[PDB]
Write a protein that holds these residues in place. Structure first.
Motif: not given
Lengths: 132, 62, 134, 131, 98
Positions: A1-3, A9, A11, A13, A22, A24, B59, B62, C55-56
């Motif tokens: 979720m972080f680049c 983040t 948009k 991935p 990951v 963008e 979470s 979300e 992955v989280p």
């Protein structure tokens, strides 16, 4: 979720094949166009090595909770290892208590024999006093 | 099991751990001990749940 | 969020090269054990075709009452029954869809026969009209 | 292969550089997560103190005959019964060791009192012998 | 279950930190005494590198009984995995037939 390249983040991935990360689309295509290398692991990468998202598919998902059988079986083994960990700690305590119990056992047996021998000596001394 | 429950035939398992059988034979002792152990595990799990609150629920939404 | 095979949420999802789709390790491993190939693409596949990605993970929030206890065994029986009933519904759906497909195909073949016959009658009728005009 | 943690055969034995002892990687990692110290030497322990090792796996009993298979609950009941019995015996061991400790305290106290008796009586007897 | 030097079943499992392979304590000690180097990568090996004496203490080992929880756990997981595979195959067939 972080680049890692920009810190924001993605948009849309995309996962790099050479190294799991990951990115963008815009920045990853920039770094691919400028050179055939991975910005993180400095290894050769190409356009095909980038993997867009193919999430939609056709199959029926589940709630992400403990109400599915792989998830429910994970909770099963979690309960089992929780009671297992409890048994581990209590068996450590049992063996430590057994060790100190044995120490106290031989100490008390020696003390009882000492008490008996001493009381024998004191009966002898009382007889010696009474001899007069 | 499919040929069995093709007519529903809901399979049965013992849920008689809340009846709390009065003083009797060894079965009363077994039920009391297992209920005590279930209670201790339930305590641990629910306190663990309230250690973090509903951040996991946020979470998930979300 | 959902493994492409059963819909399960993959705590350790993987993506393939010939067709990148989210898949769970154990199920593809058992498929390889059954047939050393991918039925999705009808091609040979190896253990290395999957890449462990980051992955989280999907948080798994517990219901109001799930704290060991016979609640867990009641859920055992309930999910047994639920997945099995899903299996029954899907099997009977197979049988109904195939029988309906056979009926539809027969009706379609008959439609092809009658459109050919009717087209021939058109040809004779058009020629009859044109030849009357003399 | 005699695992010092429960007695069950470890499917992933590990070795320690400071003091090689049989544990499992997951359990020791989890304990270090709880408390990042060596349990035996009371010294700081890190995640890199363990070396990778290969293992040959084991077999499973795989119960056949597939008849409604509800025996899982009975085995679970047996497991909690066993742990409850062991907890009761923890209680008994604590009680008995404390009772023995107290009994030892008064035994040694009585030894002191009776040795005072002995020394005084012997002094009396020897002095009257001198008289 | 066999050594890589002699082939007999090793009663004392020993492994070198420098190189990952199965060896035997007596044979590895003889090799070290003859040459103070690893036979594979020519790395130094010391006594503390080897696995020390096994320590079975306070274990009360229950024999590995057959009837046990892990078998049922694994059986249920394998069952669900197979039945879910069947759901996938036939859902693909269902979408095709639809």
């Amino acid at each position: 979720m972080f680049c890692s390249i920009s810190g924001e983040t993605p948009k849309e991935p995309v996962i790099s094949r050479v190294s799991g990360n990951v990115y963008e689309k815009r920045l990853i295509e920039q770094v691919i166009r400028e050179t055939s290398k991975d910005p993180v692991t400095q290894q050769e990468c190409t356009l095909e090595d980038l993997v867009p998202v193919k999430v939609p598919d056709f199959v029926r998902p589940r709630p992400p909770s403990a109400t599915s059988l792989p998830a429910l079986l994970s909770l099963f083994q979690e309960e089992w290892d929780s009671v297992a960990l409890e048994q581990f700690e209590l068996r450590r305590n049992l063996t430590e208590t057994k060790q100190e119990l044995s120490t106290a056992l031989y100490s008390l047996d020696a003390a009882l024999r000492v008490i008996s021998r001493l009381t024998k000596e004191r009966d002898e001394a009382r007889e010696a006093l009474a001899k007069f | 099991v499919a040929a069995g429950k093709g007519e529903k035939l809901a399979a049965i398992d013992v849920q008689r751990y809340i009846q709390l059988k009065p003083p009797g034979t060894r079965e009363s002792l077994l039920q009391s001990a297992v209920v005590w152990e279930y209670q201790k595990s339930r305590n641990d799990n629910l306190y663990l749940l309230e250690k973090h609150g509903e951040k996991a629920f946020d979470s998930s939404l979300e």
